[PDB]
Amino acid sequence: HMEQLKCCSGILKEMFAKKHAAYAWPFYKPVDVEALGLHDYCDIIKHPMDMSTIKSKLEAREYRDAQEFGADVRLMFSNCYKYNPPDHEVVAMARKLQDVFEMRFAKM
Numbered sequence: 001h002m003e004q005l006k007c008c009s010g011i012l013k014e015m016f017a018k019k020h021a022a023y024a025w026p027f028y029k030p031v032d033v034e035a036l037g038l039h040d041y042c043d044i045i046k047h048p049m050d051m052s053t054i055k056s057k058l059e060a061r062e063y064r065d066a067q068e069f070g071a072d073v074r075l076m077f078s079n080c081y082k083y084n085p086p087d088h089e090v091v092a093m094a095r096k097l098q099d100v101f102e103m104r105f106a107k108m
């Protein structure tokens with residue numbers, strides 16, 4: 001249980017690294033509704049998620065097991081697929097970052 005949570009920090013650190021930075025940058029900080037002009041984001045997305053919030057929740061003790069961590073990382077991607085159109089640039093970036101997460105998260 002304790003060993004799994006330490007590995008979860010390693011997955012988040014890889015996602016934050018310069019290697020994946022080209023498609024991981026719109027997921028670093030929370031979705032800015034006022035700056036981008038996304039008036040209906042809070043209406044459609046009920047539970048918003050970002051890499052900084054997952055990092056903060058992990059830095060504390062919000063997740064009991066790795067499954068709770070995974071559910072939050074998958075929520076971040078699910079929010080991107082629900083709100084944005086299927087042909088948007090951020091959707092393709094979410095798929096590439098999910099490919100990185102799913103590969104490392106499965107190997108534990």
Ligand SMILES: CCOc1cc(=O)n(C)cc1-c1cc(NS(O)(O)CC)ccc1Oc1ccc(F)cc1F
Binds near residue numbers: 027030084
């Ligand atoms: C209209 C798309 O807006 C978003 C919806 C969404 O679901 N996500 C996860 C992110 C963004 C998003 C948020 C920020 N700015 S921010 O400070 O909030 C985060 C750094 C910056 C870019 C963002 O996306 C893109 C927008 C245009 C483009 F050409 C490619 C993009 F990738």
